[PDB]
Amino acid sequence: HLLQFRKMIKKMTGKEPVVSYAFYGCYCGSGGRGKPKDATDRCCFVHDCCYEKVTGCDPKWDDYTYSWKNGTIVCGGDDPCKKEVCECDKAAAICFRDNLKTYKKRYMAYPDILCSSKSEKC
Amino acid sequence: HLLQFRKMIKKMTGKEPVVSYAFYGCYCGSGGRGKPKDATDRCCFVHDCCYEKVTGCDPKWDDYTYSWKNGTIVCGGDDPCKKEVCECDKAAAICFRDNLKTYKKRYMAYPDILCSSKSEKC
Amino acid sequence: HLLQFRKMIKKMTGKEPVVSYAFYGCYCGSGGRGKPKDATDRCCFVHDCCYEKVTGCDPKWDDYTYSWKNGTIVCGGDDPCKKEVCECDKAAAICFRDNLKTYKKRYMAYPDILCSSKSEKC
Amino acid sequence: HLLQFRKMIKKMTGKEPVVSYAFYGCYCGSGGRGKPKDATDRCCFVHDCCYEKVTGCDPKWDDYTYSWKNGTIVCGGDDPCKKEVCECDKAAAICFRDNLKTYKKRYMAYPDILCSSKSEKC
Ligand SMILES: CCCCCCCCO[C@@H]1O[C@H](CO)[C@@H](O)[C@H](O)[C@H]1O
Ligand SMILES: CCCCCCCCO[C@@H]1O[C@H](CO)[C@@H](O)[C@H](O)[C@H]1O
Known part of the structure; x- marks a missing residue:
């Protein structure tokens, strides 16, 4: 679930997350287009590629189980399937x-109309 | 150029266009995600696939030349390259x-958060 | 703080909030323009007028203290100042x-370009 | 009309304009909030004040007549009224x-959430 993902990003x-990553660059928002703006945006591009590989369940709305065993998410x-999306x-x-x-703050809330026309492939 | 595309949509x-198609469904807005909501949304999905194939120029901001020879865009x-994007x-x-x-009016200004998690491939 | 405001809206x-109100109408998003689209949008218009009256502190990023004494926010x-923004x-x-x-769902994620040119006064 | 305004900005x-000014700072986008980020942003703040003074017509969607007599817009x-908005x-x-x-490029596509809480007055 995105609400679990959100808790992971916050702690790490x-x-x-809703302010700093929900609208960052060209891929962190919903969907994604063009070329990743930077490193952080690449994180979202890869995460996007990750959710697309998931077939058996809903990465967005399915709840998965995890723990913070030793400062690290487990x-x-x-x-x-759900564990698969948890790893994503x-x-x-x-x-x-x-x-x-x-x-870069200039990249949060970045207008998608400014994203490249040719999108990078997973 | 999107402003030329806009003139084509208006006449046809x-x-x-800015009110009726700029935010329609899941693909007509900027970028695109999930599965096309309907026929019109499929138009945008295909158009999106079209702009991605364009390599030599900028489909969004490059001006191309065209005419309305016999009620049809030529x-x-x-x-x-520019002609390629004109055909798109x-x-x-x-x-x-x-x-x-x-x-469907219920689809213009459609919230992207409601778009499917698994996007259709070109 | 907007994150406290968000918790109030969720419970009530x-x-x-981030999905259903952060981009609703012409005033719920950041800033605001034109005439409020509906009742809910008027809530945001008024809240906007409220934050403008606040002078001593930052309504957006300042944390205030509150409680849910008897199902109602206190x-x-x-x-x-902070209490002032808490009331807003x-x-x-x-x-x-x-x-x-x-x-109205048709109003969440409403395009600001479509908002009236003459904005209502507080 | 914004499409005429766009042609003026392009030539001058x-x-x-859609890429470089449509989302610049805190005032160039739709509406406006807080304090202008810089000189360019102040241009938009003033233009915003200009459109608010216009009463008889629609500055955003009304077409006005103008010419480029001697490299200058006339x-x-x-x-x-329409001439009034043309001057704006x-x-x-x-x-x-x-x-x-x-x-400053760091200012195009600037996130409005980061704009000051107290807006400057016209
Ligand atoms: C009115 C309800 C407010 C709930 C908190 C919403 C926090 C996110 O707020 C949104 O941030 C985006 C970029 O970060 C901006 O583009 C939007 O205008 C803004 O509404
Ligand atoms: C689609 C046409 C966009 C033309 C470029 C406009 C440059 C920024 O201009 C702004 O546009 C706003 C709407 O976005 C208007 O509400 C404001 O009057 C104006 O400051």
């Missing part, structure tokens, strides 16, 4: 954390 | 015209 | 609740 | 031209 980043459960999220949150240093 | 549809010029637009405008009968 | 409305604290929020959330019946 | 600035017509536009385009030197 220290920022309010995805569990017997459902390989875990990887994205860590991706945001690693590239926090290159985070 | 009789509607103000794309000209020596530039194969010409096809979309005609696509809107043919499916005008299935146009 | 039952809807995710604003506290010794700071008259409290009033807006209740405003959304009372007009939930007239909430 | 050499930039695509507003004509017998309609004082003419002044803004010139304003953009004069401050092109201070144009």
